[PDB]
């Protein structure tokens, strides 16, 4: 029963922070020039102490053949697909708070644990765009990323079953 | 030499003595003085009996001395540094592709795994993949060559799995692939090992040992690598040459594989088989 | 001269995910509102 | 004809299918089928290491 609500909540706030930390810092350690880490904007060293903005999709030895460089450098840039994840999470959670009174039995739920799910597939193919455009360690907090998505996956689950659930009942008073 | 010299004054009956020489040198003839130093400088100096040591025999040595039959035949050698690759164990399995790698394929994996339950509960009576068990349970053994057992029903499951198996053929078969030619090349290919190779390269510098035949046979060689690396070793900076024979085992061993090493096969092959086994 | 094997595939396949799992989603969506469509 | 093609797909990939044929004549059909499947995605798989 309200189970349902409590690891919907916990998955809310789990994986939406959890995200939001990714977004932090620690998505990449190792050697740099001497080693740092970096978070996808701007790497820190251990001059050491200090911090740089390292996102510089642009570097000025190159070729760039045809929208290699352009359309998918860029893409990594401004790191669109995670901030994709961040604002359908956010869907996520205000829409089922929303969903929490207003009954409408059986639109929201299914809608927000849809956008929900899908959010999750942004936020992997996300990581895919990262771990792709950068070519030695990760960053922990990438791991809390990886591991955000992963546990927004079951919160969905347990979404659209909760979701799927209303239906038996519905249907099932029905006759 | 000591037991060989012993056996020697055992079959000559005589009294005899061990004596290191001063310098510590094999001998050779300082040029402008006609002046040789070493044991050579002991014997042609009259001031030692005999020599038995590890002494090269050369015509000029021989010019001035006499010498019995040689008693171990060797030749010219030459010494690097050796990369230590383990075998791993659990990793050689999941050797040919990357870790990350994987850990996406779990991403997809439950990922598409959930969707296509979407795809199952939604819409208003039960089908096949109406719990998410089974459809996990599909997505495994779709991803191994193990059959199928609940044929997706739904246009869009269809698709969906579709685009799986569009995923399956080319990670599978690809990992099969590199596996393939992976374990079919077990031959370790050194960088460089040669003389003429070293003589067509310029990383890694090469010296030899001072006061020593070896020197005089790379300063009286006419073959033209031969003469080439005697013109780069005789000139290259710092001095390629060093006093001791270990100055060039530990010069080699901290070299980082920069700096290879000439020498006769009796010592390196000794060395060869002596801790910390790295050369 | 001064100019003059095993390797291990890592990102190479990378773009088979990011065009094709993205359609995975595709193949969900419009489906989704098709779903719908009907129950309409 | 939905049901036959995914068949169809499905018989190429490398994955089975739970359906067959039972005609007594496209079960030639599905043969030479799978023998063209052996051949193409064969040689696929083998030139994809080098």
Redesign the interface.
């Given at each position: 029963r309200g189970v349902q609500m409590l690891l919907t909540t916990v998955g809310a706030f789990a994986a939406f922070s959890l995200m939001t930390i990714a977004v932090g810092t620690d998505y990449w350690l190792y050697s740099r020039g001497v080693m740092t880490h970096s978070g996808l904007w701007r790497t820190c060293c251990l001059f050491k102490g200090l911090c740089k903005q390292i996102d510089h999709f642009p570097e000025d030895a190159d070729y760039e053949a045809d929208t290699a460089e352009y359309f998918l450098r860029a893409v990594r840039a401004s790191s669109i697909f995670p901030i994709l994840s961040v604002i359908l999470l956010f869907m996520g959670g205000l829409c089922i708070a929303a969903s929490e009174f207003y009954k409408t039995r059986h639109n929201i739920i299914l809608s927000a644990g849809i956008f929900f799910v899908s959010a999750g597939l942004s936020n992997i193919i996300g990581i895919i765009v990262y771990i792709s455009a950068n070519a030695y360690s990760y960053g922990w907090s990438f791991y809390f990323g990886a591991l955000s998505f992963i546990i927004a996956e079951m919160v969905g689950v347990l979404a659209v079953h909760m979701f799927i659930d209303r239906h038996k009942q519905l249907r099932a008073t029905a006759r | 030499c000591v037991d060989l010299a012993a056996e020697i004054a055992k079959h000559c009956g005589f009294k005899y003595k061990l004596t290191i020489v001063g310098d510590g040198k094999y001998g050779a003839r300082d040029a402008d003085t006609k002046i040789w130093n070493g044991m050579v400088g002991e014997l042609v100096y009259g001031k030692a009996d005999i020599a038995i040591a590890p002494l090269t025999i050369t015509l000029v040595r021989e010019e001035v001395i006499d010498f019995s039959k040689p008693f171990m035949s060797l030749g010219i050698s030459i010494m690097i540094k050796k990369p230590q690759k383990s075998k791993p164990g659990v990793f050689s399995f999941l050797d040919p592709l990357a870790y990350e790698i994987w850990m996406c394929i779990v991403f997809a994996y439950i990922g598409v795994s959930v969707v296509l339950f979407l795809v199952s509960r939604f819409s208003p009576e039960s089908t096949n993949e109406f719990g998410i068990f089974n459809s996990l349970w599909f997505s495994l053994g779709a991803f191994m060559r193990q059959g199928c057992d609940i044929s997706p029903r739904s246009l869009s499951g269809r698709i969906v799995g579709g685009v799986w198996w569009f995923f399956t053929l080319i990670i599978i078969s690809s990992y099969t692939a590199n596996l393939a030619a992976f374990l079919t090349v077990e031959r370790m290919v050194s960088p460089i090992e040669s003389a003429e190779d070293l003589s067509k390269q310029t990383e890694i510098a090469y010296g030899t040992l001072d006061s020593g035949s070896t020197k005089e046979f790379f300063r009286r060689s006419k073959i033209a690598v031969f003469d080439k690396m005697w013109t780069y070793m005789r000139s290259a900076e710092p001095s390629v040459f060093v006093r001791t024979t270990a100055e060039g085992v530990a010069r080699v061993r901290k070299s980082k594989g920069k700096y290879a090493y000439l020498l006769e096969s009796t010592m390196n092959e000794y060395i060869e088989q002596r801790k910390p086994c790295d050369t | 001269?001064?100019c003059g094997?095993?390797?291990?595939?890592?990102?190479n396949?990378?773009g088979?995910?990011?065009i094709?799992?993205?359609?995975?989603?595709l193949?969900?969506?419009v489906?989704?509102i098709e779903?719908c469509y009907?129950?309409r």
């Open positions: - | - | 001269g001064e094997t095993s390797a291990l595939s890592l990102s396949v990378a088979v995910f990011y094709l799992v993205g359609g995975l989603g193949a969900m969506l489906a989704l779903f009907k129950s």
